[PDB]
């Protein structure tokens, strides 16, 4: 590289911040988005103890911290912590001053306006970027698949949203946003582990339960048969070693944790599972583009990485859909970073180069410029 | 030990003979002329100090240059001058870092032989190539070929 100017494709997310320069294949730095102040007193003098460890540093000292995510469900609830996370991302994980780089944030659909306006105001006043643009997290995941149609189910860690798109024309009346995501699955797993004796309570042990969920849980193809099998044999019980020994054995908690996605009544949510909100999102579309959406169903986001979900979802939709249509579920192996790869592709386009919100435009219309033509 | 070795070297032959008279005062009864834990321990018991042989062996290892496990007359002399300490505090770490950066005119984060020989030319004194190679090897234990911040810090560790 050299002259010229590259764009910063940041992607706030909720659970893992993924960032990197535009035009690559994978994000340069991926690290949890947690800011944890120490909670004990501290007796050693001169140890160089900081007041807040952010990012991946607080996943190593988590034994004496109180980690707290600054993004609850897509929306940002603690602006100071989010500013700290952004500052860390720019200066220590990428080491590029923001004064010389455009930024491309990402935002979930149907989010509060004030969140987006505050985001752009921060990026323009504190970090003082040249130009920033905010994009919907599902259109990027559709970019990365190399398609131009299809209905994308982007089940992140904060919020699961399902944006249908045809021929490049998004259908704003058919977006079905559901707030069940990876975090609720972690909490439900932590709640059902107590049925064997293992109690995880501290906010640090939520990370251990998350690791258990990632490494062991899988989505059952048929729920009742698995419940019957796990209750008779013992071929499912997989063991796992805690960060201090005392291995634990997970029985039928393995496929009961991610089953909450298809039956949100487990955690008390009323709505229908991710297998039926996709069909409802399709049926709201026009009668002539339903075949294409049926054939190009796209999966993205981290939580759709459970082993065996691309078959359960296809079976469910085939049960719901008319018998003639072909149901195909696109599940690329690079699912987790699909949104960021799409963001890189979009930022690398020449046609897109004039859509950025230039700073002089913000100076003339204020932060409310984001809702205007420069979307 | 290095400053003590220099002080013993700066002694003339007459001063070395005086220090050898001191040696004979210390080493009374030593079989090999080398003060192992035996004579040093008996002397310490005589003095009023009650040490353990680990400290004496560490004193030897700071001065044992061959690895024989003994303290010959030269190493015994270093033991003798170890009774007094002056090489402390290693000057100032900030001063050494700044002057190391000044040495690193190219700011590579490590010192090259070219800038080293340039500063030697500025000084202009006679140069021992074997000692230069020994210094480079001792600094470049990682075998990088260039003296680093930690490498030169350990070069001056315990030195004045």
């Amino acid at each position: 590289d050299d002259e010229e100017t590259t764009a910063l494709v940041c992607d706030n997310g909720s659970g893992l911040v993924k960032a990197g320069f535009a035009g690559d294949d994978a994000p340069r730095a991926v690290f949890p988005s947690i800011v944890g102040r120490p909670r004990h007193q501290g007796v050693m003098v001169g140890m160089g103890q900081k007041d807040s460890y952010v990012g991946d540093e607080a996943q190593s000292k988590r034994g004496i911290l109180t980690l707290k995510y600054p993004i609850e469900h897509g929306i940002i609830t603690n602006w100071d912590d989010m500013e700290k996370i952004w500052h860390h991302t720019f200066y220590n994980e990428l080491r590029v001053a923001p004064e010389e780089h455009p930024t491309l944030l990402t935002e979930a659909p149907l989010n509060p306006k004030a969140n987006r306006e505050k985001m752009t105001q921060i990026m323009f006043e504190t970090f003082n970027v040249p130009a920033m643009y905010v994009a919907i997290q599902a259109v990027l995941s559709l970019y990365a698949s190399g398609r131009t149609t299809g209905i994308v189910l982007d089940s992140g860690d904060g919020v699961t949203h399902n944006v249908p798109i045809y021929e490049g024309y998004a259908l704003p009346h058919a977006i079905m946003r559901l707030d069940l995501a990876g975090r609720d699955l972690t909490d439900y797993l932590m709640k059902i582990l107590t049925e064997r004796g293992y109690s995880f309570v501290t906010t640090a042990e939520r990370e251990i339960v998350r690791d258990i969920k990632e490494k062991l849980c899988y989505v059952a193809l048929d729920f009742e048969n698995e419940m019957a099998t796990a209750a008779s044999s013992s071929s499912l019980e997989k063991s796992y070693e805690l960060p201090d020994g005392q291995v634990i054995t997970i029985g039928n908690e393995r496929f009961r944790c991610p089953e909450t996605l298809f039956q949100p009544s487990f955690i008390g949510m009323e709505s229908a599972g991710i297998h039926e909100t996709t069909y409802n999102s399709i049926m709201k579309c026009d009668i002539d583009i339903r075949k294409d959406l049926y054939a190009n169903n796209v999966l993205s986001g981290g939580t759709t990485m459970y082993p065996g979900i691309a078959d359960r979802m296809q079976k469910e939709i085939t049960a719901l859909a008319p018998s003639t249509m072909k149901i195909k579920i696109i599940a690329p192996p690079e699912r987790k970073y699909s949104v960021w790869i799409g963001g890189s592709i979009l930022a690398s386009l020449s046609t897109f180069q004039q859509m950025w919100i230039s700073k002089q435009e913000y100076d003339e219309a204020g932060p409310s410029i984001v809702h205007r033509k420069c979307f | 030990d290095d400053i003590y070795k220099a002080a013993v070297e700066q002694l003339t032959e007459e001063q070395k003979n005086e220090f050898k008279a001191a040696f004979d005062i210390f080493v009374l009864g030593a079989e090999d002329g080398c003060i192992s834990t035996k004579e040093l321990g008996k002397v310490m018991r005589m003095l009023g100090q009650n040490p353990t042989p680990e400290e004496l062996q560490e004193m030897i290892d700071e001065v044992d240059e061959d690895g024989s496990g003994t303290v010959d007359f030269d190493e015994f002399l270093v033991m003798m001058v170890r009774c007094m300490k002056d090489d402390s505090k290693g000057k100032s770490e900030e001063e050494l870092s700044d002057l190391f950066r000044m040495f690193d005119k190219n700011a590579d984060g490590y010192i090259d032989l070219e800038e080293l020989k340039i500063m030697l030319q500025a000084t202009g004194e006679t140069i021992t190539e074997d000692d230069i190679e020994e210094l480079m090897k001792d600094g470049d234990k990682n075998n990088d070929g260039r003296i680093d911040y930690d490498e030169f810090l350990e070069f001056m560790k315990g030195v004045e």
Binding site: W79, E83, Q121, I122, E125, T126 | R101, A107, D108, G109, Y110, N142, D148, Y149, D150
Partner: protein, 74 residues
């Protein structure tokens, strides 16, 4: 408060450095003495700006050294 923090730094520095300046009533001597005070302020600003640029160069050097030691830490 971040936008308020930026506005605050800029606006409060301006307010500290802003004064009720009425050049009309001052005669030649007072006007020239005020110009001398302004030149002293310029000297101070330039001296501290050059200190800042030298500190910036030292900061770049320190960052390079820290990167080198991070490389040496593996």
């Amino acid at each position: 408060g971040k936008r308020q923090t930026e506005r605050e730094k800029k606006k409060k520095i301006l307010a500290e450095r802003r004064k009720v300046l009425a050049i009309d009533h001052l005669n030649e001597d007072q006007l020239r003495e005020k110009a001398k005070e302004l030149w002293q302020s310029i000297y101070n600003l330039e001296a501290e700006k050059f200190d800042l640029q030298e500190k910036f160069k030292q900061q770049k050097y320190e960052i390079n050294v820290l990167r080198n030691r991070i490389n040496d830490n593996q």
